Amino acid sequence: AEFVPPPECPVFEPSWEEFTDPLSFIGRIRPLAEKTGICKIRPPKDWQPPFACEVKSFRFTPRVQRLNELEAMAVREYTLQSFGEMADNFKSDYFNMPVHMVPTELVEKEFWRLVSSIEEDVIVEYGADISSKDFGSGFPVKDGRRKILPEEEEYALSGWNLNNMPVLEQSVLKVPWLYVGMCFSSFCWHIEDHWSYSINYLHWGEPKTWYGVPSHAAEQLEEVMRELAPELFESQPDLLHQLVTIMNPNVLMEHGVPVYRTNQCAGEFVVTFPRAYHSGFNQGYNFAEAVNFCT
Numbered sequence: 001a002e003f004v005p006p007p008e009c010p011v012f013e014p015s016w017e018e019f020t021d022p023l024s025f026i027g028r029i030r031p032l033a034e035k036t037g038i039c040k041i042r043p044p045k046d047w048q049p050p051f052a053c054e055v056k057s058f059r060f061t062p063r064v065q066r067l068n069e070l071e072a073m074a075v076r077e078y079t080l081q082s083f084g085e086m087a088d089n090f091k092s093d094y095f096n097m098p099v100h101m102v103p104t105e106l107v108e109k110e111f112w113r114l115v116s117s118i119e120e121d122v123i124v125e126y127g128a129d130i131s132s133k134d135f136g137s138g139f140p141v142k143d144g145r146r147k148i149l150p151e152e153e154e155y156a157l158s159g160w161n162l163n164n165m166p167v168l169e170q171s172v173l174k175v176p177w178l179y180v181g182m183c184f185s186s187f188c189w190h191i192e193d194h195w196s197y198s199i200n201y202l203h204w205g206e207p208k209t210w211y212g213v214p215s216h217a218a219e220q221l222e223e224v225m226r227e228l229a230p231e232l233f234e235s236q237p238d239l240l241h242q243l244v245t246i247m248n249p250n251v252l253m254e255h256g257v258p259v260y261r262t263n264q265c266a267g268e269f270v271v272t273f274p275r276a277y278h279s280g281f282n283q284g285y286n287f288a289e290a291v292n293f294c295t
């Protein structure tokens with residue numbers, strides 16, 4: 001009856017030589033990582049970019065998420081600090097223990113029980129899709145808006161700074177987004193527009209739990225998802241259906257869809273490959289930055 005964790009996706013720990021350029025590194029790991037849809041990359045231990053958001057003025061209105069909205073068939077303004085106090089209070093009250101003592105496996109098991117629970121109605125909030133143009137990127141940027149210390153210039157010029165990723169697509173003829181998470185805040189199964197790659201960096205906080213499906217199984221997932229979707233949504237275009245495609249990974253696994261998981265911890269990157277379906281949820285109060293790119 002309880003959730004069975006999918007197998008773990010690949011984790012790479014490049015040396016300083018292998019860490020010189022993200023595009024080259026991703027191209028090298030592609031033979032393996034494209035067979036798992038997602039992978040995790042741990043930078044060298046000394047690579048520690050400072051958090052460069054304007055924390056004093058960081059204010060936002062998160063969106064309300066009802067975990068069991070599919071089975072069942074608002075706007076308060078926070079600062080970073082006040083959302084964190086709300087987030088920690090929620091999780092410690094929910095589990096009756098300090099937030100850092102809750103095992104990742106237990107939050108994962110409870111999340112999926114809640115998504116299918118018809119008797120318990122859990123509602124959470126997600127500071128999602130915050131533009132880095134609003135209060136700045138979490139990475140230091142040579143934009144002139146904020147001041148960069150000498151020890152920070154290396155990170156402003158790093159290829160792994162998400163503001164320095166190639167985002168322009170080649171054809172005959174984008175900015176990173178920010179995510180402030182709390183326990184159980186989540187994202188539904190989707191692929192990126194134009195089947196792009198995405199790269200995701202967790203600046204700080206509790207882990208972000210991911211699930212990924214390799215691209216060779218994309219059509220298989222789509223058929224399972226539409227076979228099991230409510231009939232009212234069955235004929236909806238993909239771009240709209242993706243707004244509500246919450247589905248337990250074990251259900252996909254029972255239909256033969258390969259699924260991998262990972263816990264992305266603070267300071268780690270997750271890369272999603274072209275047409276690799278992914279979904280996930282946050283273990284607690286955290287702060288992530290993400291951008292789409294093409295190769």
Ligand SMILES: CN(C)C/C=C/C(=O)Nc1cccc([C@@H](OCCN2CCCCC2)c2cc3nccc(C(=O)O)c3s2)c1
Pocket residue numbers: 126128129177179186187188189190191200208242243244288290
């Ligand atoms: C594809 N979804 C729309 C399906 C809906 C899922 C859902 O139920 N709730 C939800 C709430 C807020 C944002 C989003 C998605 O927003 C995409 C961001 N994009 C740029 C800004 C404008 C909108 C599109 C995300 C995609 C994504 N992918 C990887 C990791 C994360 C993460 O949160 O860490 C996210 S969040 C989802």
Ligand SMILES: [Mn+2]
Pocket residue numbers: 190191192198278
């Ligand atoms: Mn995505």
